[PDB]
Design a protein around this ligand. Structure first.
Ligand SMILES: CC(=O)N[C@H]1[C@H](O[C@@H]2[C@H](O[C@@]3(C(=O)O)C[C@H](O)[C@@H](NC(C)=O)[C@H]([C@H](O)[C@@H](CO)O[C@]4(C(=O)O)C[C@H](O)[C@@H](NC(C)=O)[C@H]([C@H](O)[C@H](O)CO)O4)O3)[C@@H](O)[C@H](O[C@H]3[C@H](O)[C@@H](O)[C@H](OCC[Si](C)(C)C)O[C@@H]3CO)O[C@@H]2CO)O[C@H](CO)[C@H](O)[C@@H]1O[C@@H]1O[C@H](CO)[C@H](O)[C@H](O[C@]2(C(=O)O)C[C@H](O)[C@@H](NC(C)=O)[C@H]([C@H](O)[C@H](O)CO)O2)[C@H]1O
Length: 451
């Protein structure tokens, strides 16, 4: 018998998952508690705040001694990790670090989560999760003081990286016979042999807090903090990852829930370096290259954000008391905000259409008495793991005018352009890996500022 816990029946993955869970932090009605089944006190200090999460509110930590969350483990699950296998998982959101902060604070390692033995004059064995610039570190120290680490260096392209302001899922497995393995969003990101380490008792406390960080602006966000009593297999890591990916409220680009009456810049997943722009009022919209920021000495670059048109989302039919969140299947109206005026986005009756099937959207098209088709459904049709959205346009008899996307061509006498359209064409390509109808909604956020 080895180190993974209770073994009986070969059952569902979902069963194994629950039956090997030893701590599980959920947040409900603003209380942070453990729902694993065991009880473990969770003490929330005065300055540990709460923010929009992946499936409810999540824990937010700033850089002062008041911003902390501690779990005292129950006397049942208090040994476990001494010579045993274990797995740690959590969702994490770390803002994008400015080029000044990297110049200044890039070599500064500091803890965010840990459980390491509290001694009279020192600190002993256990584990820690920490960060250093744009690197994510996992650390193990045994009783003899021997150390093994996993250091993951994030991607230089910040529009696509894991440590640059979107929600990402972290999972870390430990097999005291082969290895420590780090995964991000279900994909093995690095590893380390831990054969030869001895005892790893752990402190009776698990501390969530910023420790030894020299930057008083740094902050992180953490959610569903969870511990298993075994080393999870790749299959199980995956079912755990998507179990959180409920479909009901849509998501903006950072992976927070989508909202009505708030400004968003659109970016097509298929060409993430173009922004959307406007020909003229009553006219159409087309794509253009976004300006970029690059800094080879710091090892960083990205397409810049916040240029283009600002879109706003309104309930097709007015609410009554209701939430501000947009669910999938929700029918909305889509406006463009330009020159202190809001113009509706839509398609008219016998308006221009590449090959009479791809209808070219117009912004604020007004006319005598000419039907302007604007009813849209905002849904998630594909690619669960990506914070993207699809828009379906209807006409006045509830027929499909199709999905919002783009098609290349050339109007009047402007130059060739990728122009915005609606067509039922996408409906036959839904299984492609990349597809021109997937869109990102991007709001201004304090965690991403352009250099
Ligand atoms: C314009 C177009 O290609 N597709 C629109 C579509 O068109 C047709 C038609 O093509 C059809 C078709 O899809 O409907 C039908 C046709 O019978 C077949 N041909 C054959 C024999 O298979 C083609 C075929 O499937 C294609 C794909 O188009 O074939 C090749 C090919 O020809 O061999 C494959 C080859 O690798 C390609 N090479 C390239 C360019 O890299 C070529 C190439 O794309 C074209 O050959 C050159 O443009 O395609 O599919 C038309 O061929 C046909 O054309 C008429 C012509 O218009 C007319 O003037 C002519 O008159 C006659 C001669 Si005369 C007057 C001198 C005597 O008659 C010909 C023949 O009839 O017209 C058809 C209907 O009018 O129609 C739909 C309708 O809704 C759309 O408009 C299609 O365009 C797509 O629109 C979308 C939304 O509007 C998107 O923008 C698509 O674009 C992306 C995307 O998914 O977003 C853009 C991405 O960057 C791109 N990434 C890549 C490269 O991977 C993707 C990618 O293409 C796909 O995602 C792969 O899945 O597309 C638009 O494509």
């Amino acid at each position: 018998k080895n180190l993974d816990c209770w073994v009986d029946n070969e059952e569902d993955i979902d069963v194994i998952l629950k039956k090997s869970t030893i701590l599980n932090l959920d947040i409900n009605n603003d209380i942070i508690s453990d729902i694993s089944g065991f009880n473990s006190s969770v003490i929330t200090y005065p300055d540990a705040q709460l923010v929009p999460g992946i499936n409810g509110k999540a824990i937010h930590l700033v850089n002062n001694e008041s911003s902390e969350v501690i779990v005292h483990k129950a006397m049942d699950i208090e040994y476990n990790d001494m010579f045993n296998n274990f797995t740690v998982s959590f969702w994490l959101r770390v803002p994008k670090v400015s080029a000044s902060h990297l110049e200044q604070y890039g070599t500064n390692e500091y803890s965010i989560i840990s459980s390491m033995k509290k001694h009279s004059l020192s600190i002993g064995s256990g584990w820690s999760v920490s960060l250093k610039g744009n690197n994510l570190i996992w650390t193990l120290k045994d009783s003899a003081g021997e150390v093994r680490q996993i250091t993951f260096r994030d991607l230089p392209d910040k529009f696509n990286a894991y440590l640059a302001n979107k929600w990402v899922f972290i999972t870390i497995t430990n097999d005291r016979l082969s290895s420590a393995n780090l995964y991000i969003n279900g994909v093995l990101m690095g590893s380390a042999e831990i054969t030869g380490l001895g005892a790893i008792r752990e402190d009776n406390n698990i501390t969530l807090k910023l420790d030894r960080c020299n930057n008083n602006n740094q902050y992180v966000s953490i959610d569903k903090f969870r511990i298993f009593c075994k080393a999870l297999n790749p299959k199980e890591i995956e079912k755990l990852y998507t179990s959180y990916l409920s479909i009901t409220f849509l998501r903006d680009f950072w992976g927070n829930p989508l909202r009505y009456d708030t400004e968003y810049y659109l970016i097509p997943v298929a060409s993430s370096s173009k922004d959307v722009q406007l020909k003229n009022i009553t006219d159409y919209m087309y794509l253009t290259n976004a300006p970029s920021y690059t800094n080879g000495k710091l090892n960083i670059y990205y397409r810049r954000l916040y240029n283009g048109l600002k879109f706003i989302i309104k309930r097709y039919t007015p609410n009554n008391e209701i939430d501000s969140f947009v669910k999938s299947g929700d029918f909305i109206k889509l406006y463009v905000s330009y020159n202190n005026n809001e113009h509706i986005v839509g398609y008219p009756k016998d308006g221009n259409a590449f090959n009479n099937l791809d209808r070219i959207l117009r912004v604020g098209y007004n006319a005598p008495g000419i039907p302007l088709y604007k009813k849209m459904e905002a849904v998630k049709l594909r690619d669960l793991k990506t914070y993207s959205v699809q828009l379906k346009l209807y006409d006045d008899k509830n027929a499909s005018l199709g999905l919002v996307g783009t098609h290349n061509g050339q109007i009047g006498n402007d130059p060739n352009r990728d122009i915005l359209i609606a067509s039922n064409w996408y409906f036959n390509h839904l299984k492609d890996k990349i597809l021109g109808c997937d869109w990102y909604f991007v709001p201004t956020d304090e965690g991403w500022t352009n250099d």
